[PDB]
């Protein structure tokens, strides 16, 4: 029994060991309580404004759309404290942890942005933070490892499986199943067991709310489409949520195509996987014929995950949102273009969203369209990876 619906159509649920059900119920009750509590809402608003620096800018990008009928804005979550959208919902979940009387945090991270967010919130709010991170990700997102540790978080490399985000997720959940009396599991994406997909959406939805207000101010009308990359789904559902009932507004989610869908080296289960049960949820996932969970691949650690949040699976199923993929090379081109032509260094995750917007423009350059890309983070964490690539490439 729950207070809120754990499903989005067929997708979602609470597929965890029985031991963890009381913790999920307690979290759901605390969330419902907090959402009605003016003191909680005021504390959360205060941290978002005065600590994280919301609202974030909405930047018009003139140079990259020159000669076309596309107008493109970027929602600047890259300017949030910590460097990505992840900080928004960590502040809310950290406040929930305190509300539940918990003094420790467990988090998983792939790009290290959720880990940095978890570490900074824990430092501010007086929580002891431990973060699991795949050993491959420890290498390719190393700047974030240094940042987490300087903020006093324990960072635990995970060598099992693919040594990437799914493996970190697995270890975090294993830990929580033994430590839930004292630790809150601060899940970093809109996925996992109920109530996480709901809480994450509700604590990220300021992205789309602000975007709506900003685009009405600057354009006097809603966007033709909003475009976001999709790992587990937090930045995309955060941008989408306030537009779901605006039926004219396209919702476009961009999964990682990796080396190309045809290679099987990707992270695009919503369009190329099939429904399964893993990580506490019923959702599309990359799986073998026999139902073993497949390892994903993306150049971008934050998208390198073999499943997707259940609300995105639902929005796809009913046709409310469309999902596409962008390859590593397409993402890299978009990264370079934004650096060179707008003076913004985007996260490789966010570069997937930008790449699809650039394709929408370039494919149909005389189509009048007003687009918003969620620029989910800044690319400081990626600069060594990208340099090494363009170097090995002979650039």
């Amino acid at each position: 029994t729950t207070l809120l619906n754990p499903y989005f159509g067929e997708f979602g649920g609470m597929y965890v060991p029985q031991i963890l059900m009381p913790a999920l119920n307690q979290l759901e009750e605390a969330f419902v309580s907090a959402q009605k509590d003016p003191e909680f809402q005021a504390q959360f608003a205060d941290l978002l404004k005065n600590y994280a620096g919301r609202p974030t800018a909405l930047t018009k990008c003139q140079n990259i759309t020159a000669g076309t009928r596309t107008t493109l804005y970027l929602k600047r979550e890259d300017l949030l404290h910590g460097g990505a959208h992840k900080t928004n919902q960590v502040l809310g979940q950290a406040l929930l942890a305190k509300r539940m009387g918990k003094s420790e945090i467990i988090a998983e991270t792939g790009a290290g942005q959720h880990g940095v967010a978890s570490a900074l919130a824990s430092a501010l709010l007086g929580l002891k933070c431990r973060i699991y991170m795949g050993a491959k990700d420890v290498e390719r997102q190393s700047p974030n490892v240094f940042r987490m540790r300087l903020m006093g978080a324990e960072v635990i490399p995970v060598h099992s499986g693919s040594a990437t985000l799914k493996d970190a997720c697995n270890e975090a959940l294993r830990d929580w199943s033994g430590s839930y009396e004292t630790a809150h599991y601060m899940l970093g994406t809109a996925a996992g067991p109920h109530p996480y997909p709901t809480i994450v959406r509700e604590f990220q939805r300021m992205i789309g709310e602000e975007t709506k207000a900003q685009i009405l101010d600057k354009e006097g009308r809603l966007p033709d489409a909003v475009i976001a990359c999709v790992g587990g789904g937090s930045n995309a559902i955060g941008m989408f949520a306030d537009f779901i009932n605006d039926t004219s507004v396209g919702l476009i989610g961009v999964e990682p195509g990796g080396h190309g869908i045809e290679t099987g080296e990707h992270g695009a289960p919503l369009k190329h996987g099939r429904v399964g049960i893993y990580f506490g949820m019923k959702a599309p996932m990359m799986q073998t014929a026999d139902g073993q969970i497949e390892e994903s691949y993306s150049i971008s650690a934050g998208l390198d995950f073999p499943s997707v949040g259940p609300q995105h699976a639902y929005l796809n199923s009913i046709g409310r949102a469309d999902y596409v993929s962008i390859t590593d090379d397409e993402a890299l081109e978009a990264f370079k273009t934004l650096c060179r032509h707008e003076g913004i260094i985007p996260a490789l995750e966010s570069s997937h969203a930008l790449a699809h917007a650039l394709k929408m423009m370039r494919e149909q350059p005389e189509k009048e369209q007003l687009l918003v890309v969620n620029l989910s983070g800044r690319g400081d964490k990626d600069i060594f990876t990208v340099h090494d690539i363009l170097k090995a490439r002979g650039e």
Partner: protein
């Protein structure tokens, strides 16, 4: 069939508890796994709990994680596990056989078809580790339609509602969790909770087997003296496999010694 019902009646008549080892099917290979399982039975196992290798076993600690990996290294698939199960049943007609499954392997290509395969090979129970009672309806329905006992978990802090649901929905045996956390021999569970054992009996639940962290005879004895019908041990068994990979004869001798001592403790 009625294999758990028959076992527990027999144990009750002898005033004994059950000792139930867990191993991963196909660890460290199909042939050796079958010999391990025959050794467990010969040494006095009352029932078996057998894991089907899964890529991401979220209720398992490193010992059983490593068992799954060894089975995968030997190329073990669920289809091969069903072939093994048919061979085990053909040799051993009365011993209750339970599977430890993760949801995706049951759900994969149809829940009903999974339980139908279990019935065909002669499995008695299925425990789906990541399906709580709240999500269990299609699993327990399919189980019962195919004469399989669906196994549910009673955690240490179970409330009354959960105790009633577990009593009603489960069959075969009730899994009495020693402690929070994941599988592992090193992390010793608490004594069986008398209140939970007593409540499950009040509500006519399937007999309780205590599991997680049971690695020593003293713990088996304590489970039975607290009123549990028996105890399950996995990691402790799997460690003996892991230690003796290059010494398969020694492996079986150590497994025999351990299982014999654990079974002796069930008589206390």
């Amino acid at each position: 069939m009625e294999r758990y019902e028959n076992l527990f009646a027999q144990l009750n008549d002898r005033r004994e508890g059950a000792f139930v080892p867990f191993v991963t099917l196909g660890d460290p290979g199909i042939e050796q796994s079958l010999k391990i399982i025959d050794t467990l039975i010969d040494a006095g196992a009352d029932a078996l709990e057998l894991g089907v290798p899964f890529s991401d076993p979220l209720a398992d600690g490193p010992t059983i994680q490593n068992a799954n990996l060894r089975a995968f290294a030997a190329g073990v698939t669920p289809a091969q596990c069903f072939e093994m199960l048919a061979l085990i049943r053909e040799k051993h007609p009365t011993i209750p056989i339970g599977l430890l499954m993760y949801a995706n392997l049951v759900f994969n290509n149809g829940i009903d078809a999974f339980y139908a395969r279990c019935e065909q090979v002669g499995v008695d129970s299925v425990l789906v580790a990541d399906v709580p009672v709240e999500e269990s309806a299609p699993f327990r329905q399919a189980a019962l339609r195919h004469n399989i006992a669906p196994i549910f978990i009673c955690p240490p802090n179970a409330d009354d509602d959960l105790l009633r649901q577990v009593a009603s929905y489960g069959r075969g045996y009730t899994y009495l969790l020693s402690r929070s956390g994941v599988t592992g021999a090193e992390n010793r569970g608490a004594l069986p909770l008398h209140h939970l054992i007593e409540k499950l009996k009040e509500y006519h639940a399937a007999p309780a087997l205590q599991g997680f962290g049971i690695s020593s005879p003293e713990q088996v004895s304590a489970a039975v003296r607290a009123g549990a019908a028996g105890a399950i041990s996995g990691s402790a068994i799997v460690k003996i496999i892991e230690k003796n990979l290059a010494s398969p004869k020694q492996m079986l001798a150590e497994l025999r010694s351990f299982v014999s001592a654990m079974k002796a403790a069930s008589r206390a």
